[PDB]
Structure formats: C-alpha cells, structure tokens
Design a protein around this ligand. Structure first.
Ligand SMILES: Nc1ncnc2c1ncn2[C@@H]1O[C@H](COP(=O)(O)OP(=O)(O)CP(=O)(O)O)[C@@H](O)[C@H]1O
Ligand SMILES: [Mg+2]
Length: 381
C-alpha cells in the first residue's frame, strides 16, 4: 500500500493529507495552496488545466470549463436532480450510457465527452500528484471522502474516479465523520450526539451523527445543495457591479473577463475579511481600459449576506426535529467547510446553541481531508 493518502474530493475545493512522522500533514499544491479547486479547463493549444490554473484561466468561454461534476457523479442522466442542476451549468451535459456526460471543446475544434467520474478522476490525479511531489514517491492507495447522503452508485462512481486516476480507493468514508475523526471525537467514552455544520463553496450540509464505542452512525442529514460561499461572493459582486454602474454609467457584465476578474478579487477579499476588518479590491484594465479600486469592510460584507447567514439555521433545526433531539442534546458541534471561517458564521452557530463552543483547532476546509489522513495513517502502518 505504501503511503496511503487522505483526499477530500470536494464539490468546489479538494484537499489532500498524509500521516507522516507522527502527525497529519496537509499538502500544498504546486501553486502553494492547501486546497485545490475541483476545476478543469483547456488552453487554445489543447492542453488540459486542472485546479488553480483552470479556475484562474481568463476566458470568454465558460462553456469549455468543467466544475461541480460532484453534483452529477453516480447519477443517471434522467435523475431530476441532474435535470435541475444542468440548468445552472454553463457547459454541455448530454445523455450517454444512461449518464450525464460532459461535452466540451478543448482546442482546435476538438470536442470531447467525459463521464462525471472522468472529470473527478482528473481532480484526483491532481491531488495524487500534489501528494507525490510532497512525498518524493508514487502514491497508489487512498482514503476518499464523500458526503453523508451519498448513495450506492455515487460511492461506487467515486471509487471508479479513483481507479481511472490510478488510485485504489481502500475506503470511502463520510465527510462529516472524517471531520469528527480529525477532532478525535471517536476516541471518547459514552454515547454522544454530534452536529456537523458544513458550509462549503456551493453547498450547505448539516449532519447529525452519534458516536458510541468508536462507531459513528449518521442519524440524519439536511442542508441546502445550492447555498454556500459562492452565494456570498455573488452578493458582493452585485454590490460592486451596482456601485461601478452608479459611478461610471457602465454595466461590467457585458464583459465576462471583467466579471471573472472581479469574482477572483472578491473571493480573495472575502477570505481576508475572515481575519481582518477591511480589504481592498483592485483591478487594472478592469473595464474598457479603466481601473477598479474599492474597499470592503467586514461589516459591509456581513450586511450584504446577513439574511443568507441566518437561513443556515433552518436546516439545523430540521435535523434536530427529525432526530427527535433538542439543542441541549448536542454534545459536540463541529464546523466544516471554508465558509465556517467567517467570524459571523461562527458567532451565529454559537448563538443557535446558546453559547456552546464548537470544536476548534483544525482549519475547517482542511478537517475532512485531515480525518481521511488519520485513517490513511493507520492503513499505511
Ligand atoms: N478564509 C476564508 N473565509 C471565508 N470563506 C472562505 C475562506 N477560505 C475558503 N473560503 C470559502 O470556502 C468555500 C469552499 O469551501 P469548501 O472547500 O468546504 O467546499 P467543498 O468543496 O468542500 C463543498 P462539499 O463539502 O459539498 O464537497 C469557498 O466559497 C471559499 O471562498
Ligand atoms: Mg466539503
């Protein structure tokens, strides 16, 4: 088996970890990031880009980039969830062998058609290479996580993505369970109720788990499949786009490269606002030669998104009701996902649970891969 890797195969961002010299190491990719976008695109010369290079390639053709393949993996073409999701995806999705294959132009007029698990295999190949460059050797085996609501076909298709990527997926484990492992909540006495609050890029997941004698049970899951940090970005996009139009009379949405540039700066500013109170957004040659310079306060970021922040509490209340539990029955609160780095998110979760502190100490966008890596450690021996 060699050194087994723990991979979080995320809808929006993936993360890879290994156990080495007595601890979990989360590995940075060749762009220096400890997370990688689950994103594929193509150069004019027909080269395939994956991760940060794909997400950051300036394009006037969103239809030939691929992302959110996790929404389609292990589902049939005619799944109503698929037929709803393809409405919001700019790339072509076509029925093939019962499944929603993704069709794109890659360069020189060449069309390709890819199974969702082929797209996921590319993301896994990238996570595999990130780990190999770190380890200085080949990696053949992995622990891969999936969302708790994944069914049999989704779990199998994730394993198949692994196979295509040259990885033997030895274990598939649930994301909120991996988070809980990362916090060592498995190494505890008695039966406990754990609420995992996972607010990611495009998805919100709430999972109620019980732990007893080292064994986790998923009691209930809920959330919103189209709610996450991307929606907070978009509220900021709208704010600056309206402002620019007020200041200049120009509507920047006419230029996609401009919108792409502002989205990238907005996403970055949002992250900085998790640890500081103000951030500058600056773009030269933003629109029709003119530059862009604005600041965003934390307070303004919260004001723009407050309603969306509060809406995350409703699926939590729902999982409690379905599990026949009240707030005081929850023994552990685990924050997962990049958006839970938002101080306001943490505050509102803590206030939902009447002042109770969540687990702390692992980066929430890293916890899932951390847990995977813990198990990978054991399997590596
Ligand atoms: N410091 C920070 N502050 C605020 N948001 C941050 C952040 N760092 C990352 N994010 C946000 O985290 C989101 C990505 O979250 P995450 O990687 O958990 O999603 P995911 O791909 O795991 C979803 P799923 O769990 O469905 O697979 C993005 O919206 C990103 O902008
Ligand atoms: Mg996640």
């Amino acid at each position: 088996v060699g050194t087994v890797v723990g991979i979080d195969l995320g809808t929006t961002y993936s993360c890879v970890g290994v156990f080495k010299n007595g601890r979990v190491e989360i590995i940075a990719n060749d762009q220096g990031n400890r997370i990688t976008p689950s994103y594929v695109a193509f150069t004019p010369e027909g080269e395939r880009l994956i991760g940060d290079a794909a997400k950051n390639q300036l394009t006037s053709n969103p239809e030939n980039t691929v992302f959110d393949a996790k929404r389609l993996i292990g589902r049939t073409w005619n799944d109503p969830s698929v037929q709803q999701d393809i409405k919001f995806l700019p790339f072509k999705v076509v029925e093939k062998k019962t499944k929603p294959y993704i069709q794109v132009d890659i360069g020189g007029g060449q069309t390709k058609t890819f199974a969702p698990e082929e797209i996921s295999a590319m993301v896994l190949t990238k996570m595999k290479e990130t780990a190999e460059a770190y380890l200085g050797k080949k990696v053949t085996h992995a622990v891969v996580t999936v969302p708790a609501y994944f069914n049999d076909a989704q779990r199998q298709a994730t394993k198949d993505a692994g196979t295509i990527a040259g990885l033997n997926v030895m274990r598939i484990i649930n994301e909120p369970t991996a988070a809980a492992i990362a916090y060592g909540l498995d190494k505890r006495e008695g039966e406990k109720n754990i609420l995992v609050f996972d607010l990611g890029g495009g998805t919100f997941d709430v999972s109620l788990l019980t732990i007893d004698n080292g064994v986790f049970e998923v009691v209930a899951t809920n959330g919103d499949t189209h709610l996450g940090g991307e929606d907070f970005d978009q509220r900021v996009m709208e704010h600056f786009i309206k402002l620019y139009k007020k200041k200049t009379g120009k509507d920047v949405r006419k230029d996609n490269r401009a919108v792409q540039k502002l989205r990238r700066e907005v996403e970055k500013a949002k992250r900085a606002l998790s640890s500081q109170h103000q951030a500058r957004i600056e773009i030269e040659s933003f629109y029709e030669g003119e530059d862009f310079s604005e600041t965003l306060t934390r307070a303004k970021f919260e004001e723009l998104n407050m309603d969306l922040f509060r809406s995350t509490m409703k699926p939590v209340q729902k999982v409690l009701e379905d599990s026949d539990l009240k707030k005081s029955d929850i023994d552990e609160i685990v924050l997962v996902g990049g958006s839970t780095r938002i101080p306001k998110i943490q505050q509102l979760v803590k206030e939902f649970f009447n002042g109770k502190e969540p687990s702390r100490g692992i980066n929430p966008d890293e916890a899932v891969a951390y847990g995977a890596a813990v198990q990978a450690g054991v399997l590596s021996g």
